[PDB]
Design a protein around this ligand. Structure first.
Ligand SMILES: *[C@@H]1O[C@H](CO)[C@@H](O)[C@H](O)[C@H]1NC(C)=O
Lengths: 47, 48
């Protein structure tokens, strides 16, 4: 509907090389009214 | 605690309004029952 919606969660953990084997809910942190076409995306690392 | 025609945001319906004990999450606006009828609602003006 032209809202780019972000759902998220934080938990502290203790793992070395796996995605945590379990279940949790993500809350809507924002619902940005942006209306654009998207096909691809990229993520930003500190250097 | 008296029967009233409630309306929040166009939700006309008749009932006793009562103060809830429900812990709705921060983003959360209407409560629906098991029956999918609305049975709780955040007030738009004041945080209850
Ligand atoms: C988004 O762009 C692609 C590639 O140009 C196109 O195939 C797609 O139809 C566009 N999205 C919409 C909603 O038309």
């Amino acid at each position: 509907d032209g809202y780019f919606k972000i759902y998220s969660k934080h938990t502290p953990i203790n793992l070395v090389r796996d995605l945590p084997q379990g279940f949790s809910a993500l809350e809507p942190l924002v619902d940005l009214p942006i209306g654009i076409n998207i096909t691809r995306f990229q993520t930003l690392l500190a250097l | 605690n008296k029967c009233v025609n409630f309306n929040f945001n166009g939700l006309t319906g008749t009932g006793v309004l009562t103060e809830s004990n429900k812990k709705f999450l921060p983003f959360q606006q209407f409560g629906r029952d098991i029956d999918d009828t609305t049975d709780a609602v955040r007030d738009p003006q004041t945080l209850e």
